Amino acid sequence: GAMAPSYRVKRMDIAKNDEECVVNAANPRGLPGDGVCKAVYKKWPESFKNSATPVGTAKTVMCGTYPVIHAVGPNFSNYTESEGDRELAAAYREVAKEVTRLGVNSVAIPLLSTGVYSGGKDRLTQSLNHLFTAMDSTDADVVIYCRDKEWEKKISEAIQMRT
């Protein structure tokens, strides 16, 4: 576990993380895909061997000794708001189980279902709150990765409001 488990946020490419494992915003088929998933495929392509897994689940594949946790959020273009919300909460619960099983002291996480899978809605609060629900009981240092300055600002505010 980390000495004083914490949440942080960084505005940079998750493929350049400084943590002991990474969470991929995966597609269910294990394809190279787009956005975070494509960056993860270019950095850790060996981790896409038999990485296909259903919506709401997480599947870990090693790249060397570095764990890639493929977490499949719902595409809100396809799911109802209600069913999508359930599957998004479930994907993060499965990430917490994998982080625990691996024994890592830190994990790099993106906000699931906030990009290509957002159905064109702002889902920062919805996705972050489900990340907290799952990860609050874990002792790994969590570092959230984002792209946009206004996302960094709001994520940082949400973290600090609990401290």
Give me the residues that bind Cl ion (CB under 5 A), please: 12-13, 115-117
CB of 82 to Cl ion, least distance (A): 19
Residue nearer to Cl ion on the CB measure, 77 or 103: 77
- The answer to whether 58 touches 97, Cβ cutoff 8 Å, is yes
Residue nearer to Cl ion on the CB measure, 21 or 124: 124
Q: Is 27 annotated as belonging to a binding site?
A: yes
Structure tokens at 158: 């949400």
Report the alpha-carbon distance of residue 163 to residue 158 in Å, rounded. 9
* Amino acid in the structure at residue 24: N
CB of 139 to Cl ion, least distance (A): 27
Q: How far is C-alpha 123 from the chain's CA centre?
A: 14
Residue nearer to Cl ion on the CB measure, 16 or 153: 16
Q: Is 30 annotated as belonging to a binding site?
A: no
CB of 24 to Cl ion, least distance (A): 11
Residue nearer to Cl ion on the CB measure, 124 or 158: 124
Report the alpha-carbon distance of residue 98 to residue 57 in Å, rounded. 10
Report the alpha-carbon distance of residue 132 to residue 159 in Å, rounded. 9
Report the alpha-carbon distance of residue 133 to residue 162 in Å, rounded. 13
CA nearest neighbour of 108 among 41, 12, 42: 12
- The answer to whether 63 touches 46, Cβ cutoff 8 Å, is yes
CB of 132 to Cl ion, least distance (A): 18
Q: Is 13 annotated as belonging to a binding site?
A: yes
Q: Is 84 annotated as belonging to a binding site?
A: no
Q: Is 116 annotated as belonging to a binding site?
A: yes
Q: Is 66 annotated as belonging to a binding site?
A: no
Residue nearer to Cl ion on the CB measure, 75 or 100: 75
CB of 147 to Cl ion, least distance (A): 9
CA nearest neighbour of 112 among 12, 18, 26, 22: 26
Task: Give the residue ranges of the annotated binding site.
Answer: 13, 27, 35, 115-117
Task: Give the residue ranges of the annotated binding site for ADP-D-ribose.
Answer: 13, 27, 35, 115-117
